[PDB]
Design a protein around this ligand. Sequence first.
Ligand SMILES: COc1cc([C@@H]2c3cc4c(cc3[C@@H](O[C@@H]3O[C@@H]5CO[C@@H](C)O[C@H]5[C@H](O)[C@H]3O)[C@H]3COC(=O)[C@H]23)OCO4)cc(OC)c1O
Ligand SMILES: COc1cc([C@@H]2c3cc4c(cc3[C@@H](O[C@@H]3O[C@@H]5CO[C@@H](C)O[C@H]5[C@H](O)[C@H]3O)[C@H]3COC(=O)[C@H]23)OCO4)cc(OC)c1O
Ligand SMILES: [Mg+2]
Ligand SMILES: [Mg+2]
Ligand SMILES: [Mg+2]
Ligand SMILES: [Mg+2]
Ligand SMILES: [Mg+2]
Ligand SMILES: [Mg+2]
Lengths: 671, 671
Amino acid sequence: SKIKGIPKLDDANDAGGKHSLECTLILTEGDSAKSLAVSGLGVIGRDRYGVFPLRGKILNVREASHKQIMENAEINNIIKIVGLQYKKSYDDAESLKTLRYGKIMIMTDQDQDGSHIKGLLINFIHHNWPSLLKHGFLEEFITPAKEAKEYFADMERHRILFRYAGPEDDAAITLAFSKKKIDDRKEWLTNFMEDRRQRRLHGTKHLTYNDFINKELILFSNSDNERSIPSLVDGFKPGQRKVLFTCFKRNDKREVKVAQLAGSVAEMSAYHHGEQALMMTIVNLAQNFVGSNNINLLQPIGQFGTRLHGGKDAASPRYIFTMLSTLARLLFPAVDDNLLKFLYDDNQRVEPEWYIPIIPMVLINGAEGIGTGWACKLPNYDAREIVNNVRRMLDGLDPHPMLPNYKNFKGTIQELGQNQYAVSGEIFVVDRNTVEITELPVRTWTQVYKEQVLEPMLNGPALISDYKEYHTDTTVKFVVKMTEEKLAQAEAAGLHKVFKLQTTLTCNSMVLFDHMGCLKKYETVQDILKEFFDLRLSYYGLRKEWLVGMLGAESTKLNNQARFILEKIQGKITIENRSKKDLIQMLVQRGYESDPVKAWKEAQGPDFNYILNMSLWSLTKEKVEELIKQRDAKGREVNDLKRKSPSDLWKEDLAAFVEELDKVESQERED
Amino acid sequence: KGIPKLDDANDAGGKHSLECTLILTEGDSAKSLAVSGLGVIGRDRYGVFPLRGKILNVREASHKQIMENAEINNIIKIVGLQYKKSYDDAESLKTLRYGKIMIMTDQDQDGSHIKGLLINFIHHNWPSLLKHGFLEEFITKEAKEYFADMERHRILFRYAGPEDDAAITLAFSKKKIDDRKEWLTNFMEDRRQRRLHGLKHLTYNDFINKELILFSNSDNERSIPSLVDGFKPGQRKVLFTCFKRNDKREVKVAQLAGSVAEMSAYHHGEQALMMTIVNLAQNFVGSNNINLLQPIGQFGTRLHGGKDAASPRYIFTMLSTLARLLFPAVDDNLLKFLYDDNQRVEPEWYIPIIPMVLINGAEGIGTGWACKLPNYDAREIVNNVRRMLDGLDPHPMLPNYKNFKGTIQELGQNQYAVSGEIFVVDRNTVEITELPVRTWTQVYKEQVLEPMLNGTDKTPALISDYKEYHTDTTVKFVVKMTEEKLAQAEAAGLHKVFKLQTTLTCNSMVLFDHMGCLKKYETVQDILKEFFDLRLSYYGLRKEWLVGMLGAESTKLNNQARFILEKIQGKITIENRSKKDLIQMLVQRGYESDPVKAWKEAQEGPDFNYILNMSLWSLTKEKVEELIKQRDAKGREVNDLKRKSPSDLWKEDLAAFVEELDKVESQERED
DNA sequence: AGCCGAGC
DNA sequence: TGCAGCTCGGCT
DNA sequence: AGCCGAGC
DNA sequence: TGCAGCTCGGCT
Ligand SMILES: COc1cc([C@@H]2c3cc4c(cc3[C@@H](O[C@@H]3O[C@@H]5CO[C@@H](C)O[C@H]5[C@H](O)[C@H]3O)[C@H]3COC(=O)[C@H]23)OCO4)cc(OC)c1O
Ligand SMILES: COc1cc([C@@H]2c3cc4c(cc3[C@@H](O[C@@H]3O[C@@H]5CO[C@@H](C)O[C@H]5[C@H](O)[C@H]3O)[C@H]3COC(=O)[C@H]23)OCO4)cc(OC)c1O
Ligand SMILES: [Mg+2]
Ligand SMILES: [Mg+2]
Ligand SMILES: [Mg+2]
Ligand SMILES: [Mg+2]
Ligand SMILES: [Mg+2]
Ligand SMILES: [Mg+2]
């Protein structure tokens, strides 16, 4: 037997023949990895090794529908290449004779997503052919072009065999991959996170499936949560946060191509994944159509998608541009950068563990994510209402309950009960024969509504006679015709009901990482707001301590510079033709201070560079007066700050933000 | 019907067919601007279909290429055209689903080329359709605005006589190459003159001679290299951008490309740029004798002639250390940098120290002409340049490829035999250790050894076996044959039989000279001499620039030293003097306005900042002494430069280049 | 017939 | 240049 | 039966 | 992420 219709397969010369069972099918993570293996095998490896590339994550066939399984081209390819048959039991040494290959060797990246793929392959064989695992059907090739040929020459040092030991192997695989084991996964990961936390307060040719799952795959599952579930503090996940950290660093005064920014992010922040995911993240951060961001931190310069297709109509990231919103640094003040804990990736300082915005951004743009064991979903809330709640809390008052609010949505959102809402579009009777639809419930896209609601009403029993569209890019308007009879009935029943203009929004999975990096479930947004509030208030306290110290050091620095300049122009000191050593010694003796700002930073020989690096211009009339004013202004600045409370600082930030939010949003409505 | 990318006009195929217009767009994106421009009402009388760029030139293409052309067939099916059918009368026009084709392309030169190719397609198969006025064009949210003003954007092509036939024919027939040379020669000549002086319906004749010809000429300007630096403009923009960036570590190719686009105003798809970057860095046998960019990653190999290069998003590059040795930074001061919309971009040409056009085999295809030069040896060219500097005639040069192990022998003027290497080991064995330049290993294996081993339907087998022992950069086949077959092959000529000899003919050495005029060179000696005269004269300009600049730097340091000496002696004070008083005083003591700034201004109030910006450290002992040394050294440097001739400067550059070339190449042999 | 490479 | 598979959980 | 989005 | 059509001239 040969394999005819699979272009990407390199079949082993002896596959399907008499030495079938001695043949190994290598499944690789992607086409590039195939090339490395095909090269490392050389001509001599072509005899007993086949190579076939997987395109990333494999269908989880456990509990997948029959249709999705039968139609899955990748699984069907593997089945064809190996000679497998659904429902066949491979116990006999004779039942094996119908196979073209005797084993599959999995070859992925030695990273967490690689482990996920190994597990999905294991899951696939385990679900359909458990018997196969008893014969040691599965193996893996671990790594850290010339290096390729080397790895393969030493293949038996890179080759690990999966081993089925008992029913605990079955339980582990099922735990990882069964849709019925979600709760077990929550417990599984809770134990893992707790145990690792404890370890931090202090300090085989063969591998069972139980150990692979519990010691290797679990690392992917945990990383999946870390990358997919947002922080309560800034509302970001790590990829989004790396994007903002990079934009803040670059400080672009003009638009940058999305693909170019993504390349720049990967470099500046040690992002370790495919840049195409990064580009999608960037697009998602810039979107501003109804039902996306309430405050987009990046500007969508170009086609970033519309409500017609829910953003699926975004242009390629090579053709669109972005830059920071003017609101971004008002929300994430640069001064607070000094208070953050910046992370390190291999000696390089990259993004902070979290930013600390002036309002809970996790509520503003609708934190959303799917991990393992847990997922997160929050709706959007109104920025002004949140600012008003923070002010109330600053004044010792109680915050008003908040309803979800989406920018530019003309519809209605009603609270049914805790974390349960009815979201309604807008429909109104014009005359008999005519209704008009001018808003769709949030996250209902215009093209989808037309196709799934209006078309079926018009065609396959038909309820309406006709409809017409008068949409713009940002608005919806359908005019629908029907007989009085039908309209009267439609109207008898609820119009919003018949035209499917009501959806429910339920939020019982507000799961976020707290400020300590612990995953937590929040019951109400008021709980989220309060936890954010206490942390942010504490950080305005830190900001004030930081500023008083730094501005104090700056004041001392200017006092010393000014003293030196006044003494120079009066003849009280001279430096002309003095040696460096003597000038230092002299300055010390006369009580000048080693760089005060440098000393302060370090505290978080003497250095008189800050004095002697001043230009000769400094000795002239206008510059002397200027220096005296700067020195007195700095003194007043520190004094003014000492008098203020952290609450006052927060209130200043909120006022500046609202002012610009007003300008920006008015301007958007003109445009 | 059954054609995915087509948005058929509702009335297409009905009784209103001839009143329908099919809009053919330049790519899928353009199709969308059109679809949203027609609004709802437009869908009735307008279809939209996207072209994937350049259309097949059908005028003399083979029947197979035409029959198998997917996009041509789709257009034919959509419009309802039929080969060979005449459309003279009114009855014939009745089988058409559309009455008009409206072409909508970019308003640029490549857009004109596509209009031209579409016109060519219809004119060739159905010239009867053109005398009716079948073809028209649409010239260019904002989309809806163009389509409501449809008539101001709609231009109709007009067939007006045999001169329309000749023009279409001139442009697109394989038989009219010579006419195109003359056609463009006249255009270049005429445009050249106005350069000294100054500054609805459309016939096919006016379209071809007024619009298409601008593409034909632009095609030459981007495809045919300059004699001076061996670059086309895209390549030149790339190097200009690398020089400006001065990267000290590797940069992703995709990212470099994005950086070139913005820094140099490259107005084409970045994917083209990424391929240019890859081609500039390649260093396998038969590519570049000197790669100006380093290939960090998989940039392709001789196995597949570079077709095996990985994606530009996964590979990195940076300047070769040879780059600024060949294109010295000092010479940038002599170039003519171009402007694109107020941004200064790359120069008309760089002026390297040897004729790079000969080193890397400048090569391209335009309209009317094409260019092909083979590679020449860098050291041999350096030697020839040194001979010319001594007033001697350069020796003739044969093409020479780095790391090529075979032979290249002249057969006639501009004609060479290039031979690989094959030798008889024993009476059953031959060994092939080199393939002729540009014969790739995998292609040789598939097209020569495989057929020799297996025979074909049309040829017998010659060999009994072969084995491969290649490395990434070398070739080694060991071939088995019967004694009888080998004797036969020897008698016929082993190199001939084994396809290890090819011809290299160079009768199309067409380049732009230093004035930007297209020229045909008969010998490389003529290229070398023209280059030499220009480069020598630019060494003269460089000396004149260096004497002026160093002179100014000397004057600057003289004034700084003087002021510092007069200060530390009490001869002058600035302490507490106003700006005006101090400037007036410096004038009256005869201090010079910034001499370097004054000199740079001359190359196209009093400024004493270069003095008064000096730090206070300047007045101290060790800095006084250091300044006096700098001053005296600058003076020595001016006179050192003044006793060097242009020829001396050139020889210094040549020596520095050869030293690094030896180092670089011997390091390459190690690795 | 199809390569070469800067473009669509 | 544009096109397409999948995972994971909550929700519908 | 499928969205949401950071990933392969 | 990887895959594929075409132009244009000189030559194999
Ligand atoms: C073909 O060769 C390989 C493909 C892959 C997958 C993949 C697999 C697909 C498939 C598409 C994709 C594709 O994802 C699409 O990318 C798009 C990128 O731009 C944005 C705008 O939109 C994204 C799509 O949302 C995503 O669906 C790949 C990008 O990065 C990957 O890892 C993806 O449709 C068919 O099956 C992995 C490999 O080895 C690891 C391969 O060798
Ligand atoms: C599908 O949508 C459109 C496609 C196009 C063509 C195109 C057309 C093709 C085809 C491929 C291509 C492709 O060229 C390939 O690109 C590759 C890009 O990376 C490098 C490494 O290697 C390049 C290939 O050498 C080139 O062959 C396009 C890239 O830029 C273009 O203009 C190309 O195979 C089938 O037909 C134009 C449009 O509107 C103007 C479209 O809407
Ligand atoms: Mg990986
Ligand atoms: Mg969102
Ligand atoms: Mg264009
Ligand atoms: Mg070349
Ligand atoms: Mg699911
Ligand atoms: Mg041709």
